[PDB]
Design a protein around this motif. Structure first.
Motif, short mmCIF file in Angstrom:
data_model
loop_
_atom_site.label_atom_id
_atom_site.label_comp_id
_atom_site.label_asym_id
_atom_site.label_seq_id
_atom_site.Cartn_x
_atom_site.Cartn_y
_atom_site.Cartn_z
N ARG A 5 -0.13 14.59 30.24
CA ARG A 5 -1.45 15.17 30.47
C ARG A 5 -2.50 14.29 29.78
NH1 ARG A 5 -1.05 20.09 30.41
NH2 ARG A 5 1.21 20.26 30.09
N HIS A 8 -9.43 13.38 28.49
CA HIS A 8 -10.53 13.22 29.43
C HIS A 8 -11.10 11.81 29.38
CE1 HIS A 8 -10.08 17.49 29.77
NE2 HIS A 8 -11.10 17.59 30.60
N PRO A 28 -9.13 12.50 33.01
CA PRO A 28 -8.19 13.59 32.71
C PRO A 28 -7.30 13.96 33.89
CG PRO A 28 -10.54 14.31 32.80
CD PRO A 28 -10.40 13.01 33.53
N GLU A 29 -6.38 13.08 34.24
CA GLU A 29 -5.42 13.35 35.30
C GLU A 29 -4.04 13.65 34.72
OE1 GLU A 29 -7.92 11.48 35.70
OE2 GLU A 29 -8.72 11.81 37.71
N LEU A 30 -3.22 14.31 35.52
CA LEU A 30 -1.82 14.58 35.18
C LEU A 30 -0.95 13.59 35.94
CD1 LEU A 30 0.23 16.23 33.64
CD2 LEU A 30 0.29 17.86 35.55
N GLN B 13 -14.21 21.98 26.17
CA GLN B 13 -13.93 21.13 27.32
C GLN B 13 -12.46 21.22 27.69
OE1 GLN B 13 -14.14 16.72 26.67
NE2 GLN B 13 -15.02 16.71 28.74
N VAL B 14 -12.19 21.47 28.96
CA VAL B 14 -10.83 21.64 29.46
C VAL B 14 -10.66 20.81 30.72
CG1 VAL B 14 -10.64 23.96 28.48
CG2 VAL B 14 -11.37 23.66 30.86
N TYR B 15 -9.40 20.59 31.10
CA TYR B 15 -9.06 19.91 32.35
C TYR B 15 -7.85 20.60 32.97
CZ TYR B 15 -8.88 16.07 35.71
OH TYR B 15 -8.92 15.31 36.85
N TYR B 17 -4.92 19.91 34.74
CA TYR B 17 -4.05 18.81 35.12
C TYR B 17 -3.35 19.09 36.44
CZ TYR B 17 -4.88 17.73 30.22
OH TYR B 17 -5.47 17.46 29.01
N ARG B 18 -3.12 20.37 36.75
CA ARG B 18 -2.51 20.76 38.01
C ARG B 18 -3.46 20.56 39.19
NH1 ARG B 18 -2.46 24.96 40.70
NH2 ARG B 18 -3.57 26.13 39.07
N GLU B 36 -1.81 24.60 33.82
CA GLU B 36 -1.81 23.23 33.33
C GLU B 36 -3.17 22.83 32.78
OE1 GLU B 36 1.08 22.19 32.65
OE2 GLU B 36 1.75 20.79 34.20
N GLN B 38 -5.64 22.46 29.58
CA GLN B 38 -5.47 22.19 28.17
C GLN B 38 -6.83 22.03 27.51
OE1 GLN B 38 -2.58 22.11 26.06
NE2 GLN B 38 -2.01 23.27 27.89
#
Lengths: 51, 51
Positions: A5, A8, A28-30, B13-15, B17-18, B36, B38
């Motif tokens: 994960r 950002h 912020p990519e998975l 701040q969140v992302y 990932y899914r 997903e 975080q």
């Protein structure tokens, strides 16, 4: 699956050794590693003064 | 569910990932993390002089 994960304001660089192709994704990519994809483990300097 | 109760003059701040999307919400909102999503854990300086 091994999936990292990415933060950002961060970038992770991988290569599909099975497919002979290079890709690096910032932001912020998975990431999803293909069975022969491997990470760019980065040894970075840290510590109080430096290491 | 993991939900953080953001203070009024604060930003989290969140992302997802899914879902490959970035979002940051300031103000006093109640964030609801997708499976997903975080958080942006922030190591901040404190102590009497500084740390």
């Amino acid at each position: 699956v091994v999936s990292y994960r990415v933060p950002h304001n961060a970038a992770v660089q991988v290569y599909d050794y099975r497919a002979k192709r290079a890709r690096v994704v910032f932001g912020p990519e998975l990431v999803t590693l293909d069975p022969e994809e491997q990470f760019t483990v980065l040894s970075l300097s840290a510590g109080r003064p430096k290491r």
